[PDB]
């Protein structure tokens, strides 16, 4: 899935996720979000199962973005946890957690949760 | 929080999270889980807000473990999303998502969710 | 504007489960749930709540409900809660995320909760 | 063993919110919820469900409930569902994770859900 996972992906929001799957199970690349307090590209890193089952299961993976770059800092980080599914129209199916820095009076409301699905089709 | 975040942490399960905060916002290190289909250490990587607010807020961060090493492969990955809180007894407060590789008939049940709190106190 | 009639009826989700719901005048949700997935058979009681006076700005209507997976046929020692919102219009949807908690011992509690997302559409 | 009396009563959580619940003989949960956090004032109706015949192996009792954040004082256009389990014994607890969904437009829907975890303990 190295060849499969590596590429430019787009989620249902129009966000762009450019990723490289390393030989050692590493994930690196960039994330540009179409939503929220975000501007231009952000660094990401993660990990994926570099030896998945050969039974029709997807390939487990996850990656993190801390929303700081040279343009903006949203004092937050998102983690996507999901799996890659290969074939004709390959998909990456994820759920995510977005934690913002918070005070102890704020902490109960510090984490947003959602789900993103990624394909390699360039939106229009 | 570079000096603060870097260290050996332990969660409520007795798991060991050894991490280094890089200068560029990188997180690296190892994770050994006291629970589940896991054995000895796993590679992790993530990101943290390397320039947090100076207002009493925590430092947003996240990191990923793919549960494959040279001992075992659980065909799953966990992402922890949370924040670091410094001071006398520093804590890392997280929520997490654990996705396993799944078939399309299995996918509805592929993701576990929980919360881990980390301190630098060595259990007994 | 209030969505008593928009919400009340029969819905299916993407697994083929059947959600039969009545939205009461006072914010109550009642009905039955038949799951096409998991350790479930036939219909289960559900109860929930919805915002009986939503904003007029085009926002959806917040709601939630619970199924405990015990009926006269089977008992899966677990409960799901769906949290999400009703969105009216030509193709109405109920968009949800859910938490499915199983009875667990202390040793198994870390793995006691599944998380997912279901979209419901209404049928005549 | 069934926990009608174990669950029924007044509980507080770690924010200082007050959860007043009656577990009915047929699996129903009813009561009120007063939150010490957020856009909330005084008591809100809740309804939920619990496993009325849990396993006898030491596992807790699965349950869930919903609050919609409209009462006679305030309407926060949102609903929380708590999913978790009751654990009896000398220090009984209700351990939950929760999803809090707010009414959202299509532009804001990606940010419409908060996630967290509450532990409840019972008071005389
Ligand atoms: O907007 C961002 C950074 C952009 C995240 C974009 C998200 S990532 C998941 C989804 N998928 C995408 O592709 N794009 C979106 N961060 C906010 C979070 C909420 N914030 C607070 C404020 C106060 N308290 C709590 C939280 C303020 C900062
Ligand atoms: O046990 C692991 C790997 C160890 C994860 C340990 C977890 S990480 C969050 C928590 N915090 C820790 O410190 N430790 C625990 N993975 C399972 C997941 C559930 N599995 C399935 C099987 C079939 N369908 C769906 C899921 C099988 C593989
Ligand atoms: O299968 C069911 C009951 C049917 C749930 C149906 C689910 S509701 C959300 C989704 N939307 C639907 O329409 N259908 C599915 N319960 C299992 C869950 C797995 N179980 C454990 C045990 C321990 N740890 C983790 C999980 C034990 C029992
Ligand atoms: O504050 C409340 C109602 C009070 C909820 C109390 C919560 S229940 C879970 C936790 N346990 C408790 O005991 N107390 C707290 N609702 C807000 C939430 C933030 N809101 C948005 C809007 C858009 N996107 C995301 C969030 C708008 C309205």
Task: Specify whether the CB–CB gap between B83 and A101 falls below 8 A.
Answer: yes
Chains that touch A (3 or more CB pairs under 8 A): B, C, D
Q: What is the rounded distance in angstroms from the CA atom of residue D120 to the CA atom of residue D60? A: 14
Q: What is the 3-state secondary structure (H, E, C) of A70-88?
A: CCCEEEEEEEEEEEEECCC
Q: Rounded to whole angstroms, how far apart are CA atoms D84 and C113? A: 8
Ligand 4 binding pocket mutation candidate from D13, D33, D38, D96 (most atoms within 8 A of CB) = D38
Q: Please, what is the end-to-end C-alpha distance for chain A in angstroms?
A: 27
CB atoms within 10 A of CB D25: 8
Contact B91, B72 (CB under 8 A): no
The residue range of the domain holding C79 is: 1-124
How far is the C-alpha of B32 from the C-alpha of B47, rounded, in Å? 19
Q: Is D27 exposed, middle or buried (0-12, 13-18, 19+ CB in 10 A)?
A: buried
Give the span between the Cα atoms of D35 and D13, in whole angstroms. 9
CA–CA dist A30, A19 (Å, integer): 7
- For residue C72, count other CB atoms closer than 10 A to its CB: 9
Compute the distance between CA of residue D110 and CA of residue D61 in angstroms, rounded to an integer. 33
Approach to solving: X-ray
Domain count, chain D: 1
> CB of A77 within 8 A of CB of A51?
no
Interatomic CA distance for residues C118 and C124, integer angstroms: 20
Mutate to test the interface with B, among C38, C110, C114, C117 (most CBs of B within 10 A): C110
Q: Compare all CA atoms of chain C with the CA of A94 and give the residue at the minimum distance.
A: C116
Contacts of C83 (CB under 8 A, 6+ apart): C63, C64, C96, C97, C98, C99, D66, D79, D80, D81, D98, D99, D100, D101, D113
Query: Phi and psi of D7, rounded to 5°?
Result: -85, -40
Cβ of D107 below 6 Å from ligand 4: no
| Closest approach of B115 to chain D, Cα-based (Å) | 8
CA–CA separation, B18 and B120 (whole Å): 10
Q: Select from D84, D81, D48, D22 the least CA-distant residue to C47.
A: D48
SS3 A24: coil
Q: How far apart are CA C89 and CA A70, in angstroms?
A: 42
Half-sphere exposure of B13 (CA within 13 A, CB side): 18
Interface subset of C 39-98, CB within 8 angstroms of D: 45-55, 57-70, 75, 77-85, 95-98
Among residues C14, A90, B101, A114, which one has the least CA distance to residue D115?
Answer: A114
A25 close to A55: Cβ distance less than 8 angstroms? no
Q: Look at phi and psi of residue D58 and say left if phi exceeds 0, alpha if psi is from -120 to 50, else beta.
A: left
Task: Return the DSSP state at A12.
Answer: T
DSSP C28-52: EEEEEEE-SSSS--S-EEEEEEE-S
Please count the other Cβ atoms lying within 10 Å of the Cβ belonging to residue A121.
Answer: 9
Q: What DSSP designation does B109 have?
A: G
Q: Which residues contact C65 (CB under 8 A, 6 or more apart)?
A: C21, C29, C46, C47, C48, C49, C81, C82, D66, D81
**H or E, element range at A116:** strand A111-119
Q: Is C50 annotated as a binding residue?
A: no
DSSP per-residue string spanning D52-88: SS--SSS--EEEEEEEEEE-SS-EEEEEEEEEEEEE-
> H or E element: which one contains A45?
strand A42-48
Contacts of residue C5, defined as CB under 8 A and 6 or more positions apart, other chains included, come to: none
**Which residue stretches of D1-124 are H helix?**
4-7
In sequence order, the 6+-apart residues with CB closer than 8 A to the CB of A110 are A99, A100, A101, A102, B58, B83
- In sequence order, what are the beta bridge partners of B93? B83, B117
Q: What is the largest CA-CA distance in chain A?
A: 48
Positive or negative torsion for Cα D32, D111, A80, A46: negative
* Nearest Cα residue in chain D from A114: D110
Instruction: Residue B62: name the closest of B39, B75, B78 by CA.
Output: B78
Q: CA-to-CA distance for D99 and B95, rounded, in angstroms? A: 13
Contact with chain D for residue A25, Cβ under 8 A: no
DSSP C5: H
C-alpha dihedral, B118 to A116 to B72 to C37, nearest 10°: 110
């Amino acid at each position: 899935d190295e060849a499969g996972i590596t590429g430019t992906w787009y989620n249902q929001l129009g966000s762009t996720f450019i990723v490289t799957a390393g030989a050692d199970g590493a994930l690196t690349g960039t994330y540009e979000s179409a939503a929220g307090k975000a501007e231009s590209r952000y660094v990401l890193t993660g990990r994926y199962d570099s030896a998945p089952a050969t039974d029709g299961s997807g390939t487990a993976l996850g990656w993190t973005v801390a929303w700081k770059n040279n343009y903006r800092n949203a004092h937050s980080a998102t983690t996507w946890s999901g799996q890659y599914v290969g074939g004709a129209e390959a998909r990456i199916n994820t759920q995510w957690l977005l934690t913002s820095g918070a005070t102890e009076a704020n902490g109960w409301a510090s984490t947003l949760v959602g789900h993103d699905t990624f394909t390699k089709v360039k939106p229009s």
